[PDB]
Amino acid sequence: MHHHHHHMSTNPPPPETSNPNKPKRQTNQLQYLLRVVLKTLWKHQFAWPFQQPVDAVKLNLPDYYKIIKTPMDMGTIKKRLENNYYWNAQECIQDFNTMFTNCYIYNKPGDDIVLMAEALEKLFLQKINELPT
Numbered sequence: 336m337h338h339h340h341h342h343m344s345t346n347p348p349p350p351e352t353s354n355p356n357k358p359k360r361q362t363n364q365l366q367y368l369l370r371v372v373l374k375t376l377w378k379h380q381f382a383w384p385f386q387q388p389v390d391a392v393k394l395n396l397p398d399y400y401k402i403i404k405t406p407m408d409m410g411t412i413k414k415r416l417e418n419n420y421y422w423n424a425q426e427c428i429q430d431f432n433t434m435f436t437n438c439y440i441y442n443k444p445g446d447d448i449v450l451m452a453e454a455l456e457k458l459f460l461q462k463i464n465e466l467p468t
């Protein structure tokens with residue numbers, strides 16, 4: 336009997352950050368999203384949980400990828416912006432929104448991680464209010 340000791344929880348492959356066949360553009364709005372929005376958030380004291388995919392093995396979180404089927408993180412967004420993966424700013428904004436929403440879904444309103452996400456989301460909304468027209 337193995338008693339399933341080998342069936343450990345693993346991480347899914349991370350989201351795609353490069354695809355030569357996807358339509359992409361560099362727009363002024365996307366350049367602002369990299370240079371101002373992403374760079375500002377990256378340096379925030381609460382950014383660290385969001386700078387890479389959730390590692391279910393390190394964090395002992397066998398349920399995470401059962402609940403969250405569209406994961407997103409800022410490391411992925413950074414690589415997408417640097418690799419010019421996006422066609423327009425709304426595609427990138429959607430990724431930020433997914434990242435925040437995932438955190439609110441998985442956790443509960445009083446939790447420290449949710450206060451961290453809310454602080455980042457506040458700063459995100461401040462910065463995209465000045466998105467170039």
Ligand SMILES: COc1cc2c(c(OC)c1OC)-c1ccc(OC)c(=O)cc1[C@@H](NC(C)=O)CC2
Pocket residue numbers: 384385389394396437438441442443446447448
């Ligand atoms: C045992 O230590 C940690 C364990 C976890 C997390 C975490 O980062 C704050 C830890 O600190 C290193 C954690 C990480 C990221 C999350 O989303 C980005 C999340 O939704 C949720 C979490 C954690 N949830 C809570 C309520 O903080 C659970 C897993």
Ligand code: NA
Pocket residue numbers: 438439440441442443444
């Ligand atoms: Na929740």
